[PDB]
Amino acid sequence: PAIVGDEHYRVAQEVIRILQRYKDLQDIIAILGIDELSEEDKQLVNRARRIERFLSQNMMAAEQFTGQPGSTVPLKETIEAFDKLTKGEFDHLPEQAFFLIGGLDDLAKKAESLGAKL
Amino acid sequence: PAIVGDEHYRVAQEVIRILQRYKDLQDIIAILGIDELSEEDKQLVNRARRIERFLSQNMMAAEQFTGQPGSTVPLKETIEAFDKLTKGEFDHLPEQAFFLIGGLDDLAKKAESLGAKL
Amino acid sequence: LADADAMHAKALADAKAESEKVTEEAKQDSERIAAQLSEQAGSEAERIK
Amino acid sequence: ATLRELRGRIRSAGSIKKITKAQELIATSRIAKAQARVEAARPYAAEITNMLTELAGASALDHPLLVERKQPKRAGVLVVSSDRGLCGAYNANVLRRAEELFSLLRDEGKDPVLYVVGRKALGYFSFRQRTVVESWTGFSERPTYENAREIADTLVNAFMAGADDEGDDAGADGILGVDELHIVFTEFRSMLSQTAVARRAAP
Amino acid sequence: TGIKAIDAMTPIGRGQRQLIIGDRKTGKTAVCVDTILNQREAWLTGDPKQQVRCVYVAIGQKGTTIASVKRALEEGGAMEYTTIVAAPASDAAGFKWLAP
Amino acid sequence: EAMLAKTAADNRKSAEQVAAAQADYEKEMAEARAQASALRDEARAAGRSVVDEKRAQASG
Amino acid sequence: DVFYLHSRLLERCAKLSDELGGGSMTGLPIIETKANDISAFIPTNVISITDGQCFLESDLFNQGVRPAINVGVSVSRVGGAAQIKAMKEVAGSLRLDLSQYRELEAFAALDAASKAQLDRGARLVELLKQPQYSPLAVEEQVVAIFLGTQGHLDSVPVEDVQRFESELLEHVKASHSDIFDGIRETKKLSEEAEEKLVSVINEFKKGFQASDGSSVVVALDPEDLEKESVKVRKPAP
Amino acid sequence: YRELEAFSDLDAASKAQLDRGARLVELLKQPQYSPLAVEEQVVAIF
């Protein structure tokens, strides 16, 4: 928090906590799937899957592979977007809406193309 | 049985059997939960948890690590108490009543402090 | 009905009294907190010097 | 310690595997038991349907249970879920269909009034903080006609109490009721297909 | 040490060896540096029966990491009662073996 | 008839009004508590501002 | 002789007798494990030399448990002798209680006693969290652990525990500062000091807000919607 | 018996196998320093 600010640190720590809980629950999920978890854990797992997909990005150097131009996300937008994710503001969007995109505008466009409205 | 006598040997063997079965069921309980065990298995698990707690003892040399003075349990009392435990005569007490105590009197006092009755 | 009216009036009066008391206590706590934090800041400034 | 940990995990996974295979076979037998119960219940249902048909064909259709209400704004919904959890997505599918029905009722400007069967739906709605007017649990495995009679009695009493209600006022009844009864439950299409469905039971 | 989790559950006395053991980036250096900094009041008392003199031995550490530790000690005033024995990564194996 | 109706209304209103008085007590308690918490929060925020200001000045 | 290398190094950290001046040297050796393998050669060597260990986890660190002390495995071999009387009194069996709580939480992953144990353990875990560069004086630590183990956090929600603690400590620092003075000077918590602290806690609970503000004192397609009907043998009227 | 050891709503044959296996397992047990003559073993196994 000294260097990157209090909100950056808080959002990063919440993302890390959610992903750590998902990693812990992988043992149960590999056998029984998601449906044996509690409601809190089910919600957290959905949030974590969306978060891990949203950490991916269409890179500039990846265009040669996929043909898709890369994206740049300002740090402030990244912090805002992951704060919204950690609070469950995008839980209704499908998981693939968060995959290989840039900021929140890309998220809206891809969700709309899939069928969900942000 | 020849050296320690039939009662001591039988009680020890029954304790060992219960603990072995509990060890076998531990992972089942961890993954699928305890509600999916049979009634006999659930009863055995309750008994085994109480037995393992009651095998612990407030040791004389451990006071510096707990502040609690130690206790000494005569062999006859130990055999009697573990016979009762294996028979299920203390299943009505919380398992926390069995943690770091001496003989049966200490068990009764701690159960009273926890609201249970022995 | 009479008992309920009396009990309600008493409860409301006691609520007002307790609200005043807690508010003034909170004001005193805030004053002491400000004083202590000012002392702590002064110590920090001396350390910087 | 890597090898020791892996060996412990192998033993744990073997135990889980044995338990799951046993439970699968037990569920296979339980499916036959449940189908036998459905078959046993078939004839009474068919014949009582015939009796109702005759009575309706020889009487006037003025029963409040049979006539809708005007500008309805309350529909009772009974969500039938399980008690144990080792079912794959049964409870999730039931609750998703219930949510679809709730959205549909919201479209019709009607606030759903929730009744629940089974513990899993209780947990779901408690997490969502949605109120449950009444709940019955502990028989989803082997429901008897006693439980169904109690549930239907409660729902019908609520629906009747909804006749005199005005706005949010209970009215002459003294208790607020509902204008509709829907049932959300899983329909046993076949051994392979099990579909959650919403079915308006009244009016 | 000023850390509840340690002072309450794994208390450290004077003359004791307490091992801080864990994977990388788990907070080991943070715990040790916090412990060193906590002795500031004891030092300010001026009573040698209460004062604690700290020695921070850095073995095989990156030079800028040791500089960061020294800066943290400076800011908290600990550097007055602290000595750093530095054997950075660039040093020969002899210094790394010998520093403790 | 008016006496009986008024008595039924009296029982109902007295019960609901006792409940309402208790709820109003709790509401006043919550409002006063929130006021106290807000005073403490703003006081500590002002203190933090003062310490930051004076530390910055000392550094300069 | 790699074990000897560290054994002769760490054995020089001692507490001298009065005849040698009563000086002391406390050692805080650090050991890095790989993939949480305390069974590696050097970690096992050192663990068998020192007087206890604080074992830190990446898993606990990521969960927000910071410092990431693994309570079950971490121990001090001096124990109460390395604590002041008040800390001993309040933290007498905290580590053992937390170990039992972790065991139960894994088991219960339920009677009233188990619920109470889980609640208290969650509150204690919250209490032991601490930011970096935020030392707590021994008296403040004593008061915090007193909040924890004496059951004064049971009414407080888990998510607020930390905040509660801080606020309460601030309160005791702003007013009733003689509690800290007494603990620091006498190295123990007097019975009347304990009573004053309990009264202060109970009073402060009146003015504390939880996260929710609570008091701590004490569309389906209509066609798919199948419709029940009554069969009637009549001409369409 | 070891196949069925994971399991009561079974076939009559399965229940009989389970009970028989439990009895056989209990039969194969033996205390220390207690060797049996071959004929006694034959009768017990019978």
Ligand SMILES: Nc1ncnc2c1ncn2[C@@H]1O[C@H](COP(=O)(O)OP(=O)(O)OP(=O)(O)O)[C@@H](O)[C@H]1O
């Ligand atoms: N109590 C704490 N609360 C929050 N962050 C902490 C805490 N302790 C340490 N950290 C942070 O965790 C990270 C790792 O800390 P630290 O450098 O002390 O760990 P380490 O185990 O010594 O690491 P390394 O492997 O780099 O030597 C740093 O960002 C430090 O700021």
Ligand SMILES: [Mg+2]
């Ligand atoms: Mg380090």
